Paper text:
Intriguingly, IR and IGF-1R αβ monomers are capable of forming signaling-competent hybrid IR/IGF-1R heterodimers in tissues that express both receptors. Within these hybrids, one αβ monomer derives from IR and the other from IGF-1R (Soos and Siddle, 1989; Moxham et al., 1989; Soos et al., 1990; Bailyes et al., 1997). To endeavor to resolve these issues and to understand the mode of assembly of the hybrid receptor and its mode of ligand engagement, we present here a single-particle cryo-EM structure of IGF-I in complex with an IR-B/IGF-1R hybrid receptor.
The retained 3D class was then further split into “head” and “leg” regions to allow focused refinement of each map volume, achieving an average respective resolution of 3.70 and 3.73 Å for the two regions. The structure described here is similar to those of the single-liganded forms of the corresponding homodimeric receptors. However, more substantial variation is seen across the respective receptor leg regions, where varying rotation and displacement of pairs of FnIII domains leads in turn to varying distances between the points of membrane insertion. Within the current structure, inter-monomer contacts form between the respective α-chain insert domain components of the receptor monomers, and IR domain CR' is in contact with the adjacent IR domain FnIII-2', appearing to preclude contact between the membrane-proximal FnIII-3 domains (see, e.g.). However, the points of membrane entry of the FnIII-3 domains are closer together here (ca. 27 Å) than in [IGF-I]-bound holo-IGF-1R (ca. 40 Å) but further apart than in insulin-bound IRΔβ.zip (ca. 15 Å). In particular, we note that variation in the relative displacement between the points of membrane entry is observed within the extant suite of insulin-complexed IR structures, suggesting that the source is sample dependent. The C-terminal (non-helical) region of the IGF-1R αCT segment appears also to associate with the adjacent IGF-1R domain FnIII-2 in a fashion analogous to that seen in the apo IGF-1R ectodomain crystal structure (Xu et al., 2018).
Numbering used by the authors:
A (entry chain A): 578 to 649, 671 to 706, 742 to 897
B (entry chain B): 1 to 162, 168 to 307, 594 to 656, 770 to 922
């Protein structure tokens, strides 16, 4: 037996929050009676601009939607045109020859360790210890027999995101409001402790009898006051909803909080 | 400079950065450069490794399955030109299955002499669609940008804009940058291959890609033609002979290369012979060696189909370079190519939709005969205006003019500098309720269409305020109206953003409002 080929067609799906389904095909050349697969998933942190882009005025929000949908006469060509159209066959051939000379030993911020387990005879595997809507890198190595003496097969990577936590990116508590001169308002709220990936910005919809006026609050500007200050509102009983925006799009809003902009 | 280091053969590095020390002082590599299968490597392993001496390769550069490698701006900070003498299945620069890669970092590469660029299946790779390979490669029809984070996740991967050169492709117009700290330089077509300087002075004809001194065949970074003795030459004088088509060697040099591997057979190197006054691996047919000296000697005497992939580039506001490939089934001796083009109409929703939503950045948005030529330059065009092109190949004379069906592709010219520059001074209106209405004349010919107006105003001594005016706003107010202002003199600036990115900032204008006190 030799080092097996990589697991072919590794797909994944987001079954439920904190859960992920991974479904793949057996390797092309198992090179031996295949014993099992090694499912190794590691957390993937944020990127640079994910904490720098002032998404209130920079650009659209980059989201990574989960691929849950991945759950589910004629005449042959002659030999001349077949040889003429053979263009990418030798390409992938030499790339797999390159990867054939590697191994993966069966070992037992960006400081996230990996979690490795064995899947005996299942091309599908459910992971139930994840974070709602966060990037996860799963590396699978089709281990044949003698995969400990020779080393398991080469790594095949895939990236997936879990299901967002249902109504988690909302404000995890009651908001507070403060009146200020010029009939100004300052709102302060907590941040979701376990957001669906990351709270990129907050949307504050307020207005007279209808949340018509809108305001954006970036990620870092929030920490300057634990919230944001609307500079002017007309004197009167006003209302404002705060529907945050996580990495999974806009979330939920607790309540259109009331505040006294006028005076008694 | 032009002679910074020594010569190295082609090498394959695997499994660790330990063997990468063999190419420390290397400047040129007479072969390929393979760095692949680095599994146990860590990002900190690469942060303290560099090769500033490596400036030029000959065949190509390959990177495949090198974990922890986030960028290359530190590995090859001075790689300038790949000669591309050989090709990896027409690909002159391959980057495949790079896991932790998020950008390119090859800011100093300015030309690939021959081949294509293929970058596929790098799930974390950004900064990939924000680069124009036309100013870098000659033939970009063969290429691969798929299964990448920028094609599916919309990396954004903005460029340094505290300014990067913004090139035009068939329909799109996006800035050019390799990292968030390196703008991709592009130079005028007048000396497409000679090179460039910082001030725009073009390089010498003998240089390639770049030179440290303008119009000097000695201070070149890489030589276009054969190199010899610290100076790029068009053709080396006798007795030196051309070797590997890039540097000329004398008889004594390519002699040792012959005898050395003739007996050692270390890698079966080429027994270079001097034919056509050039030390060539093998002398061409109808010629043999003298059997005593390496100088070779001549032996005694012994309707069509659719035109393929027509892409278009624009290197000017009134010009367009249209390139294509002959159809797969000419179905006859192709006499001349038939080209039709017409001005497209911009999408109607763009004239009325809101743009002050989710950031202020915008998305990437007659006939003629051609005889014995696969390209055509089209003049007399409107700047940045989308043009729908129709191209057909014809294989019969005009009196019997029957030929292929109509192909279709979209073209777009280059934007202009002052086309988006708001003209005329901004005017204001006085009101008793401290409500001001602002008016400014937009140019009648924008690069595409003006989509919004970035308005910035500020009273003397106060803090700068930022506004966003959508299509509908100045469609009704003919501008923008501000309410509840503090009495005093203000300083206002505007920048109109069109389909060709952000325009210019208007000169800070100042107006006076009666303070109702004097
Ligand atoms: C990058 O630099 C190169 C070198 O100056 C530019 O090159 C072109 O150079 C190649 C290399 O010799 C020429 O091609 C070869 O083409 C000839 C054509 O007869 C063929 O006989 C040879 O067997 C070989 O295949 C190519 O013709 C030439 N083209 C032009 C327009 O000069 C290249 O254009 C530069 N690219 C950029 C983006 O600046
Ligand atoms: C999708 O998730 C559900 C629960 O959210 C899974 O239901 C479970 O099935 C697994 C089998 O792998 C069992 O180990 C669990 O005990 C089951 N839990 C419950 C509450 O029924 C389901 O298997 C997952 N996969 C699919 C395809 O539905
Ligand atoms: C051509 O290459 C040289 C060096 O390889 C580049 O010069 C760097 O250029 C800046 C000014 O532009 C100098 O301050 C540095 O000292 C140069 N570096 C070195 C190592 O000499 C030059 O910019 C390149 N030309 C272009 C057009 O990019
Ligand atoms: C390999 O597997 C087949 C069927 O799964 C079995 O019949 C055979 O005995 C196995 N061989 C070894 C060496 O285990
Ligand atoms: C390091 O890489 C070289 C080839 O680059 C390989 O021969 C060697 O086995 C690897 N491991 C060590 C410990 O050098
Ligand atoms: C590279 O240059 C340094 C300094 O001149 C020298 O010590 C070293 O030996 C050179 N590289 C090799 C492989 O010798
Ligand atoms: C654009 O490229 C063509 C092709 O060589 C050239 O003739 C033309 O001058 C170029 N445009 C400019 C503005 O230099
Ligand atoms: C096609 O026409 C060209 C002239 O346009 C001529 O040189 C060539 O021989 C012709 N070939 C055939 C097959 O008709």
């Amino acid at each position: 037996a030799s080092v097996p080929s990589i697991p072919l067609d590794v797909l994944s799906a987001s079954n439920s929050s904190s859960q992920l389904i991974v479904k793949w095909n057996p390797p092309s050349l198992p090179n031996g009676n295949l014993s099992y697969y090694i499912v190794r998933w590691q957390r993937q942190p944020q990127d640079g601009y994910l904490y720098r882009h002032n998404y209130c005025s920079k650009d659209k929000i980059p989201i990574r939607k989960y691929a849950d949908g991945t759950i589910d006469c004629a005449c042959p060509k002659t030999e001349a045109e077949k040889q003429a159209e053979k263009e990418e066959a030798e390409y992938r051939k030499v790339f797999e020859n390159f990867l054939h000379n590697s191994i993966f030993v069966p070992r037992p911020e960006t400081e996230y360790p990996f979690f490795e387990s064995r899947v005996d005879n299942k091309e599908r595997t459910v992971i139930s210890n994840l974070r709602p809507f966060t990037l996860y890198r799963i590396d699978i190595h089709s281990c044949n027999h003698e995969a400990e003496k020779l080393g398991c097969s080469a790594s095949n990577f895939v990236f997936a995101r879990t299901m967002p936590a249902e109504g988690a990116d909302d404000i995890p508590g009651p908001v507070t409001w403060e009146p200020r001169p010029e009939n100004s308002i300052f709102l302060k709220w907590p941040e979701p402790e376990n957001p669906n990936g990351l709270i990129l910005m907050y949307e504050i919809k307020y207005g007279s009898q209808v949340e018509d006026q809108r305001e954006c609050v970036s990620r870092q500007e929030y920490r300057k006051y634990g919230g944001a200050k609307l500079n002017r509102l007309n004197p009167g009983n006003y209302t404002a909803r705060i529907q945050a925006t996580s990495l999974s799009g806009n979330g939920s809003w607790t309540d259109p909080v009331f505040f006294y902009v006028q005076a008694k | 400079h032009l002679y910074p280091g020594e010569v190295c053969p082609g090498m394959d590095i695997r499994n660790n950065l330990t063997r990468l020390h063999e190419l420390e002082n290397c400047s040129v590599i007479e072969g390929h450069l393979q760095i692949l299968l680095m599994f146990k490597t860590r990002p900190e392993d690469f942060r303290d490794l560099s090769f500033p001496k490596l400036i030029m390769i000959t065949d190509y550069l390959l990177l495949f399955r090198v974990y922890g490698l986030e960028s290359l701006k530190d590995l090859f900070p001075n790689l300038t030109v790949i000669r591309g003498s050989r090709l990896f299945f027409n690909y002159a620069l391959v980057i495949f299955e790079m896991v932790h890669l998020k950008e390119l970092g090859l800011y100093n590469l300015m030309n690939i002499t021959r081949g294509s660029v293929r970058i596929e299946k790098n799930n974390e790779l950004c900064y990939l669609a924000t680069i124009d390979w036309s100013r870098i490669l000659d033939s970009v029809e063969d290429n691969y940008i798929v299964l990448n984070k920028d094609d599916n996740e919309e990396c954004g991967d903005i460029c340094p804009g505290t300014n990067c050169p913004a090139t035009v492709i068939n329909g799109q117009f996006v800035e050019r940058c390799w990292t968030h700290s390196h703008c991709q330089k592009v130079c005028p077509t007048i000396c497409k291959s000679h090179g460039c300087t910082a001030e725009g002075l073009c390089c010498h004809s003998e240089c390639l890609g770049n030179c440290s001194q303008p119009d000097d065949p000695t201070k070149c970074v890489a030589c276009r033609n054969f190199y010899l003795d610290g100076r790029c030459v068009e053709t080396c004088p006798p007795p030196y002979y051309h070797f590997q088509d890039w540097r000329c060697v004398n008889f004594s040099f390519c002699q040792d290369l012959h005898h050395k591997c003739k007996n050692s057979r270390r890698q079966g190197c080429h027994q270079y012979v001097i034919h056509n006054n050039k030390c060539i691996p093998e002398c061409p047919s109808g010629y043999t060696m003298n059997s005593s000296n390496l100088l070779c000697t001549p032996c005694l005497g012994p309707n069509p189909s659719v035109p393929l992939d027509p892409i278009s580039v624009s290197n000017s506001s009134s010009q367009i370079i249209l390139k294509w490939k002959p159809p797969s089934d000419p179905n006859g001796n192709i006499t001349h190519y038939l080209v039709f083009w017409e001005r497209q109409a911009e999408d109607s929703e763009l004239f009325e939709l809101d743009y002050c939503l989710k950031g202020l950045k915008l998305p990437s948005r007659p006939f003629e005969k051609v005889v014995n030529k696969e390209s055509l330059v089209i003049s007399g065009l409107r700047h940045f205006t989308g043009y729908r092109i129709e191209l057909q190949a014809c294989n019969q004379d005009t009196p019997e003019e029957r030929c292929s069906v109509a192909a279709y592709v979209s073209a777009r010219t280059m934007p202009e500098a002052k086309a988006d520059d708001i003209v005329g001074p901004v005017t204001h209106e006085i009101f008793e309720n401290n409500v001001v209405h602002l008016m400014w004349q937009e140019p009648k010919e924008p690069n595409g269409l003006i989509v919004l107006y970035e308005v910035s105003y500020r009273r003397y001594g106060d803090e700068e305020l930022h506004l966003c005016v959508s299509r509908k706003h100045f469609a009704l107010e003919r501008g923008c109206r501000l309410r509840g202002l503090s009495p005093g003199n203000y300083s206002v600036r505007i920048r109109a953003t069109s389909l060709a990115g952000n325009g210019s900032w208007t000169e800070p204008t100042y107006f006076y409002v009666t303070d109702y006190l004097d």
